[PDB]
């Protein structure tokens, strides 16, 4: 298991506001583990290195949360032939 917080089908509720920083706290165990950030239904937020920074010790940090970040988000990673997910719900 890569995520520190054990999984639930049931998302963890994160409160956010437009404008202020947003942390998807999906921390992990090794720096060399690839984690996809998905937002329902079909968006992938790709780490670019300035608005979407991927920190292996914090999760994903988002500066300037627009409306496009409100909803059900999932962190995904595949380790040893198995797909792992952690769910979050953003609520303004």
């Amino acid at each position: 298991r890569p995520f520190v917080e054990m999984y639930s089908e049931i998302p963890e509720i994160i409160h956010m506001t437009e404008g202020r920083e947003l942390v998807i706290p999906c921390r992990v165990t090794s720096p060399n583990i690839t984690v996809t950030l998905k937002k329902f239904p079909l968006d992938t937020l790709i780490p670019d290195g300035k608005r979407i920074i991927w920190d292996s010790r914090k999760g994903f940090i988002i500066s300037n949360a627009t409306y496009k970040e409100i909803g059900l988000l999932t962190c995904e990673a595949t380790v040893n032939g198995h797909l792992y997910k952690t769910n979050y719900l953003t609520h303004r």
Binding site: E9, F40, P41, Y67, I70
Partner: protein, 94 residues
């Protein structure tokens, strides 16, 4: 029990069948009565995870349907009516 992610997916933002009156797509047809008087169209609907966003079409397409017009006293007609379907939806600021 419907699992949460299905509950979510089912109400979030999507193109959903609803029944729409023909006269609401063809309002110049006042005098008469189409048969059926309402048709099934795909329409964007949802709670969008926020009461300050709403679910709007982002991609659409045309469909054509066979309908009948039963007339005042002239005689009945066949008609092919085009409508616009919602193919993709997204959440946008009100």
């Amino acid at each position: 029990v419907v699992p949460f992610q299905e509950v979510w997916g089912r109400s979030y933002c999507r193109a959903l069948e609803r029944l729409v009156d023909v006269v609401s797509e063809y309002p110049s047809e006042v005098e008469h009565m189409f048969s059926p008087s309402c048709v099934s169209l795909l329409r964007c609907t949802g709670c969008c995870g926020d009461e300050n966003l709403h679910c709007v079409p982002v991609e659409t397409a045309n469909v054509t349907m066979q309908l009948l017009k039963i007339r005042s006293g002239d005689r009945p007609s066949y008609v092919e009516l085009t409508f616009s379907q919602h193919v993709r939806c997204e959440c946008r600021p009100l």
